[PDB]
Design a protein around this ligand. Structure first.
Ligand code: MET
Length: 521
């Protein structure tokens, strides 16, 4: 079925400034969105901030300022940071938005009408910092900031406290079998596979019911009132998850401002999300709670949840590192170095090794070679002569690359897509070295035509596929290659030979380098 490809990041708590973790999750969301745009699809990419709850309200109290002002100031910080990181996100959502609250109330009301909400009690541990309910098995002994003995979450290491409250309870226990059916019937719905196995293990053990409201005093009245009961507030996480449904129902003007909430999500053709990007820290909320809420309400479920390895004396500032090494380079590094296990070396030394090694030497040198006046004497795509077997071995690698990369982008596993494209770039370099086109200018012009054509076309296709990762630099490369705009996107242009011979290269500049090398100081 044809619809808008809907890709989301988590909405981030605004208790503190944005940092690398927030940027990384939103980068992944951005890359996925961008790849689907390049394929010619309609996309709606969504990020935002999670502004209610006890965590945020008590952070605003520490700063001695009103939650309203505090949340707006920090959300400002997020917005500015994401603008400066040069994403292409379609909307930024805030849970303090009035339309969002309307949607939270309608959803809540559906759960109640369905019979899946009753008045009960929660008596147990709670992590305010994770806004998470924990069983006694998930807490251990530790210290607080006053050095006194306390209890801490096994999940996150954060301080836990005992909560004994009359709360509205959601009948999560009744969604065990349907969730198990869903995981089993859609074995790609949670990525990577080992996190899918975790979720199934947990749900197999049994599910308790879930507190979805809290007494208003505990939350400092900084939350959404429960419809029909002003003494209770809606659980920050039920509120937070609904943002995906709210975003799917907002009409957004050119300015990026919400101008309307539609009654029915089908009108905008976004819901349910094709991909929810998250950190491992918030797996349970997205793979257990959220689909249970959707199942109760009669709403379609998401298609994929991808959980990366990060957690949503030493600092690594995203913008500070981008000014020094480059936005596109920094974004490449983050996506190249980081798998799903997240055992990443994020040092300056490794960043410089990849910039010099892969971007400068593998990609950059290749672009300069096939565009330089010394090799491409006529500043144009030449017409190839007959191909040798060695020529065709390379052409086949280039031909197969789009189908392979496409699969990786769709898992989604951006690291694997990047490695595959550089696998092909490495081969093109090896081919170029093998053919020494610098010599051929004299020896054999006809042969030089063939080699050059295959190289340009290899650089174009690899670059098209790397354009979601390197949005600005891909444009520079296409400019240099003289690739018309029509050919810079669309699945028609993954095909080998889409740019006809005779196409003229873009103009040159004296100092032009794509990625300049940096010393190993
Ligand atoms: C519905 S996503 C909510 C995520 C939460 N605000 C966090 O920062 O982990």
């Amino acid at each position: 079925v044809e619809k808008v490809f809907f890709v989301t990041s988590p909405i981030y708590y605004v208790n503190a400034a944005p940092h690398i973790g927030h940027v990384y999750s939103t980068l992944i969301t951005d890359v996925i969105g961008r790849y689907h745009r390049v394929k010619g699809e309609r996309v709606f990419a969504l990020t935002g901030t999670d502004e209610h709850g006890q965590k945020v309200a008590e952070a605003a109290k520490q700063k001695q300022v009103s939650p309203y002002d505090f949340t707006t100031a920090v959300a400002g910080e997020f917005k500015k940071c994401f603008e400066q990181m040069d994403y292409s996100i379609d909307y930024f959502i805030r849970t303090t938005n009035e339309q969002h609250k309307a949607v939270v109330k309608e959803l809540w009301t559906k759960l109640e009408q369905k019979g899946d909400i009753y008045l009960g009690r929660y008596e147990g541990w709670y992590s305010i910092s994770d806004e998470s309910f924990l069983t006694p098995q998930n807490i251990t002994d530790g210290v607080d900031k006053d050095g006194n003995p306390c209890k801490v979450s096994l999940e996150s290491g954060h301080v836990v406290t005992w909560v004994s409250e009359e709360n509205y309870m959601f009948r999560l226990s009744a969604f065990r079998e349907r969730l198990l059916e869903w995981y089993h019937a859609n074995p790609g719905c949670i990525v990577p596979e080992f996190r899918r196995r975790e979720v199934i293990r947990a749900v197999e053990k049994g599910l308790p019911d879930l507190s979805v409201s809290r007494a208003r005093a505990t939350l400092h009245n900084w939350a959404i009132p429960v419809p029909g009961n002003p003494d209770h507030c809606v659980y920050v996480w039920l509120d937070a998850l609904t943002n995906y449904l709210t975003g799917s129902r907002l009409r957004v003007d050119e300015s990026g401002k919400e101008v309307s909430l539609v009654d029915d999500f089908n009108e905008l053709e976004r819901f349910p999300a094709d991909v929810h990007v998250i950190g491992k820290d918030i797996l349970k909320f997205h793979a257990i709670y959220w689909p249970a809420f959707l199942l109760s309400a009669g709403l379609p479920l998401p298609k994929k949840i991808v959980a990366h390895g990060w957690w949503t004396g030493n600092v690594f500032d995203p913008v500070e590192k981008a000014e020094e090494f480059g936005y596109d380079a920094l974004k490449y590094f983050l996506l190249r170095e980081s798998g799903f296990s997240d055992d990443g070396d994020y040092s300056d030394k490794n960043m410089i090794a990849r910039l010099n090694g892969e971007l400068a030497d593998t990609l950059g040198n290749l672009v300069m070679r096939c565009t330089s006046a010394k090799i491409n004497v006529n500043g144009e795509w030449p017409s190839p002569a007959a191909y040798t077997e060695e020529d065709e071995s390379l052409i086949q690698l280039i031909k197969d690359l789009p189908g392979t990369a496409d699969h990786y982008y769709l898992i989604p596993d951006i690291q694997k897509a990047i490695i595959a494209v550089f696998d092909v770039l490495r081969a093109i370099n090896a081919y170029v070295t093998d053919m020494a086109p610098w010599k051929l200018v004299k020896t054999d012009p006809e042969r030089l035509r063939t080699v050059l054509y295959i190289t340009l076309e290899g650089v174009r296709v690899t670059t098209l596929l790397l354009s979601p990762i390197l949005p600005r630099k891909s444009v520079v490369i296409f400019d240099m290659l003289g690739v018309p705009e029509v050919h810079r996107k669309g699945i028609e242009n993954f095909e080998f030979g889409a740019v006809p011979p005779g196409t003229r290269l873009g103009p040159a500049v004296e100092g032009e380098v794509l990625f300049s090398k940096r010393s190993t100081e």
